[PDB]
Each structure stands twice: as C-alpha cells, then as structure tokens.
Design a protein around this ligand. Structure first.
Ligand code: HEM
Length: 412
C-alpha cells in the first residue's frame, strides 16, 4: 500500500483519524512513539493518501519556511480522506479548497493577499483596539460571575468572547451574532452540494452589503480596509474579499475559545499556578503562550512537495503529501522539558501553536492580546476554579481542543 510506508498501521490510524484527538492519552503517546522511533516517516492507511508525518519541532519549522518546496495550494491544505476531498472538489469546481483564503494560496499570490491586512494585524495596530477588547472581556467576565459558582466555562463564556472580538475587528454589528455563530458553529462546524452552494451564496450576499457600504462610508476595520483595497488599480474580486471575511472569522473563533478553555483546565488542575498568576500579572502573557502550547488547538495542516527533497535523511518525492503535527512539535523533548505539564512559568516558550513560516497565523498578535486582556479581567475576580467533571474535547484532526469545561468557582 505505497511501499515506502513504514509507520505501523496502529500508530498511523491513531494519528490520522479524528476519533483519537478527543482524548489526550490516546494521541500524545502515539506521537511520542513516532518522535522517538520514526520521527519522519510515511503512513498509508485505508481511505487516505500516503503521507509523511512531520512530528519533530525542527522539521515543522523547516517545511513551513519553504513554500517554494512544500505547497499549500497544490493539494488540500486540510486533512481529508480521498472520499471527502472528492466531495469537496465537486462543491469547489475541480480544486481542493472550498474557498479562496490565504491557506489555499502559494506565493506570489499569497504574499499579495496576505499583504493587504498584514500590518493591521501587527502589534502596534492591534493596540488601538484595547479599550474595546477590555469592554468585551468585562462583559464576558460578568456573565460568568453571574452564575452562582458553577457553569460550563466554554458554552457560558469563552464561546462568545473570541467571536465578539473578531466581529469588532471586521466591523460586523453586535446584533448579528446569530448569523456569525451560524457561520462558524453550524456551516463551518465539525444533495449536500446543492445546499452548500446556496448557503455560501447567502453569506456572500450578506458580507457584500458591508463591502459596498465601506466603499462609501469607511471606518477603521478590516472590512473597510479590504473593501477599499485595490491590487493593480482594481478592487479585489468579490470571491477573494468574501473568502477573506470568512477565513478571519472562522480562523479566529474556535482556536481562541479552545485555548482559553485549555488555560482553565491547566489552572484548575494546577491551583498553584492560579495563585502565581494572581500575584504577578506580568505572568498572564506567559500563561497565554503556555495555554496555546499545551492546548495546540490546530492539530494539523497539510503540504504537498513540489520537488524531490530531503528532510531528516528522508527522500520526499515530488507529489508527496506531508502532515504537519503542531501538537507533536509542541511536546518535542528536544525543545521542552516535561512537555505534558501545564506550567505557566515556562520560558522560553518557543511553541509552534501558531505555526511557523510563510502562513504563520495572521491573527497571533490579536489572539495573544484578547486572551491576555480576558485573563487580566478574570483572574482577580476568582478566589478559585476547579473542574466539576471531565472536559469534552472535539474528535477532529483539524481544529479541536476543549468544547465543554464544566467548572466550579468561588468569587473573590
Ligand atoms: C490561539 C489562537 C490561534 C491559534 C492557535 C491559531 C493557529 C493558527 C495556525 C496553526 C495556522 C497555520 C499556520 C501555518 O501554516 O504556519 C493559522 C492560520 C491563520 N490564522 Fe490563526 N490561530 C489563532 C488565532 C487566530 C486569530 C485570532 C485569527 C484571526 C484574526 C487567525 C487567523 C488566521 C489566518 C487568516 C490564518 C491564515 C494565514 C495564512 O495562510 O497566511 N488566527 N492560525
């Protein structure tokens, strides 16, 4: 079954299939076997293409730095079994990408489209939003504190906070939360082509009304920036502007909620850390990097090789699919000691949670700023937080992490 495939089928099924990601003691041991035994090897299971699994921190940095060699755009950047990639190419008119977002793009296209928002996402630009993001965090902290010491931290709090922040960055009204939750939770959640096609049409007509509006009535927000952008003396095609609004909102919602949940499971299991964080606010930034390392919400992205190459003495033929495991890179013993412990003091924390390379998460500065402001508002409000039952994690090999964290808390 592709004779170059060496990973034992049991490990291979555990790392690829979506089931095992709902449980950390299923998936982290398998990846640990891989890093210790077959750090970069080929797996081929039934229903999927052969693929190399880059499990080492150093190999994920190296593949991600070379877009000329390992392509986003040639195959599906998302891990789908053949069956599914097929249904998708139907929906998508031949090509393995459901919308034309930055992740489906190789440079120079990618550099141009990414270029349009890149500086709006840089730290200095993101500071303008601070009074707003603190207003949103206080409303969300209040909501949780209105419970008498019990709630699901996700579905009662962290589900809405990251969506409110990305709605404000885009310029979408507070009142359209229903439709944005429908976009990220229902339509892009975890005949069908007939209903796909007219549902994306309805969202595109909706966003289209904002593009037109920002073109006569400009505001400082991402919709206005991209509406009014022009590449070669012409406005960006509506397909790319609307895929960009969708890419930011979906890319920015679940990853930030999941990492905030991850932080609460880590502090609930390690009360010495809550106490440490409460006594030195300077440590919140440290807690945010550790929550995103430890949680690793994006479990993988894919790459297709554009030439025969060699990484860690392996000979990657042209056309080979490669899986990038951000969870395995964040627990590589060559970079981190006791990588399974949640430890907020961990420094330096050079995790690959936001990726590395050309496609490195555009929203990383916005994601660290809104998680830091949320926790600065929340931690002083709590005397304690503990889990009241097991977190429920999403079974998915793409964006998973906690979906339910039932907690008990005492107000300060
Ligand atoms: C803690 C939260 C977040 C995590 C863990 C996360 C993770 C990632 C990862 C792993 C990638 C792939 C990077 C690569 O291939 O090198 C990515 C892509 C991306 N993320 Fe995030 N992300 C987070 C928050 C955000 C936010 C808040 C936004 C939106 C403002 C966002 C927007 C994007 C976009 C647009 C891309 C595509 C960039 C490109 O292809 O050029 N992300 N993110």
């Amino acid at each position: 079954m592709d004779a170059r495939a060496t990973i034992p089928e049991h490990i291979a099924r555990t790392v690829i299939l979506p089931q095992g990601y709902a449980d950390d003691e299923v998936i982290y041991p398998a990846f640990k076997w891989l890093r210790d035994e077959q750090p970069l090897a080929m797996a081929h299971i039934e229903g999927y293409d052969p693929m190399w699994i880059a499990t080492k921190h150093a190999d994920v940095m190296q593949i991600g730095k070379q877009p000329g060699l390992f392509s986003n755009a040639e195959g599906s950047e998302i891990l789908y079994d053949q069956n599914n990639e097929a249904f998708m190419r139907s929906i998508s008119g031949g090509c393995p990408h459901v919308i034309d977002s930055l992740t489906s793009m190789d440079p120079p296209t990618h550099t141009a489209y990414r270029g349009l928002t890149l500086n709006w996402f840089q730290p200095a630009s993101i500071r303008k939003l601070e009074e707003n993001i603190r207003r949103i965090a206080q409303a969300s902290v209040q909501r949780l504190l209105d419970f008498d010491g019990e709630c699901d931290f996700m579905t009662d709090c962290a589900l809405y906070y990251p969506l409110h922040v990305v709605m404000t960055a885009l310029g979408v009204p507070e009142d359209d939360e229903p439709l944005m939750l429908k976009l990220t939770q229902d339509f892009f959640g975890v005949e069908a082509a007939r209903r796909f096609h007219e549902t994306i049409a309805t969202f595109y007509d909706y966003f289209n009304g904002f593009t037109v509006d920002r073109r006569s009535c400009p505001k400082d927000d991402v919709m206005s920036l991209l509406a009014n952008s022009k590449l070669d003396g012409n406005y960006i095609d509506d397909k790319y502007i609307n895929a960009y609004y969708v890419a930011i909102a979906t890319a920015g919602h679940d990853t930030t909620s999941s990492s905030s949940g991850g932080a609460i499971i880590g502090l609930s299991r390690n009360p010495e850390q809550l106490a440490l964080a409460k006594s030195d606010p300077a440590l919140i930034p440290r807690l945010v990097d550790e929550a995103v390392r430890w949680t690793a919400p994006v479990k993988s992205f894919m790459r297709t090789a554009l030439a025969d190459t060699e990484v860690r003495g392996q000979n990657i033929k042209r056309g080979d699919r490669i899986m990038l495991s951000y969870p395995s890179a964040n627990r590589d013993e060559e970079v981190f000691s006791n990588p399974d412990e949640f430890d907020i003091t961990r420094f330096p924390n050079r995790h690959l949670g936001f990726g590395w390379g050309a496609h490195m998460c555009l929203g990383q500065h916005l994601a660290k700023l809104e998680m830091k402001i949320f926790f600065e508002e929340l931690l002083p409000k709590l005397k304690s937080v503990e889990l009241s039952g097991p977190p429920r994690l999403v079974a998915t090999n793409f964006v998973g992490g906690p979906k339910n964290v039932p907690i008990r808390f005492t107000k300060a």
